[PDB]
């Protein structure tokens, strides 16, 4: 037996964010940890809404296995999900993609450097050139 008895407890219907929010309580028996993707799929099947319009986060195993408790939101449309859900979560899901920043330190340094010049530094470049030459 694998079972995976999924439950949506504490269901708040939320029109203000176009979602349904609930505590996900899932049963394991003999199987360790449900995996998020699978859970999402299950939720989608339950609720008829698209798999990408489902979001599940913040899970903990009961201690001694058997159960997992977490938090789940099901948005009305995929568009809705896109425009209300945090970016990291979206990335995790597979919808939105990773933003490619440098390490924050580098950014800070860059900013500081920028501070040190007044205006766009094309004139400055020219000055450096010509002055360097003679």
């Amino acid at each position: 037996s694998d079972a995976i008895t999924i439950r949506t407890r504490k269901v708040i219907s939320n029109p203000l964010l176009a979602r349904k929010q609930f505590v996900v309580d899932v049963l394991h028996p003999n199987r360790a940890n449900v995996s998020k993707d699978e859970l999402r799929e299950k939720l989608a099947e339950a609720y008829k809404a698209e798999k990408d319009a489902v979001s599940v986060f913040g899970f903990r195993t009961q201690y001694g296995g058997g159960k997992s408790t977490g938090f789940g939101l099901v948005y009305n449309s995929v568009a809705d999900a896109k425009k209300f859900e945090p970016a990291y979560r979206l990335v995790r899901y597979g919808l939105a993609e990773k933003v490619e920043k440098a390490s924050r330190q580098q950014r800070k340094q860059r900013k500081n450097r920028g501070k040190k010049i007044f205006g766009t530094g094309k004139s400055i470049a020219k000055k450096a050139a010509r002055r360097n030459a003679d």
Partner: protein, 260 residues
Amino acid sequence: ARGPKKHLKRLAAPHHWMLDKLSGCYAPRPSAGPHKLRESLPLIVFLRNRLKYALNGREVKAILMQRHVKVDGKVRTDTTFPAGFMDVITLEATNENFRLVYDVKGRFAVHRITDEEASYKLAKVKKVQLGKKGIPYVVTHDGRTIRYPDPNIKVNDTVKVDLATGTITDFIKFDTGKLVYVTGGRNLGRVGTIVHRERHEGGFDLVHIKDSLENTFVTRLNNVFVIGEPGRPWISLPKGKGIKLTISEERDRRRAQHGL
């Protein structure tokens, strides 16, 4: 030290925010608004920590932005907007209307209300004066100034503001044997009748209040907010009709009304 303070530490917050000790160092400081900092209730708190429609500050902000929350008809977009006593919070989606009233214990209660009551706001009178060009104005203890008031409206009198325009529709004179609500101190959240009004012309008038169960108590005049004529309030009061049980009584109630 140097100008106004702009942060609020989590412990220094009003206790009736019901804010948890952990999960953060800071509390949402109410912005400059209609209600006093300590007597207010920021929109964020209302949204996240009461109704649970938002999970975090970002969510709350998002909710605010799509122009959906309405404090006293007017829109609002501040996360830290200080909605206080008698303020009507209307959500366009859900079609729920709320009035911010206290409960038996002290904190702000989630009090669901119909559209027929949500149209008006009830407000105490703080000041009555002639303004510029000799024009009389009334000041509500809840923010407003209303020009050309009915000239037998005095201080401490409560006023039915129609909210949609902001005009006085009707009023209650402050007098003995009139239904009252307590808005400050230990007795805050309690409903009563006004048995007697002590004066002490110099510092702080004390009003004696009896509730429905014949149980007298005394509070300062500026903590006392008229609500109607006894038995017949102008607004709907929250569950437990501002009554205050003893602890034992409360326990008994909890026990005897078990239905798990």
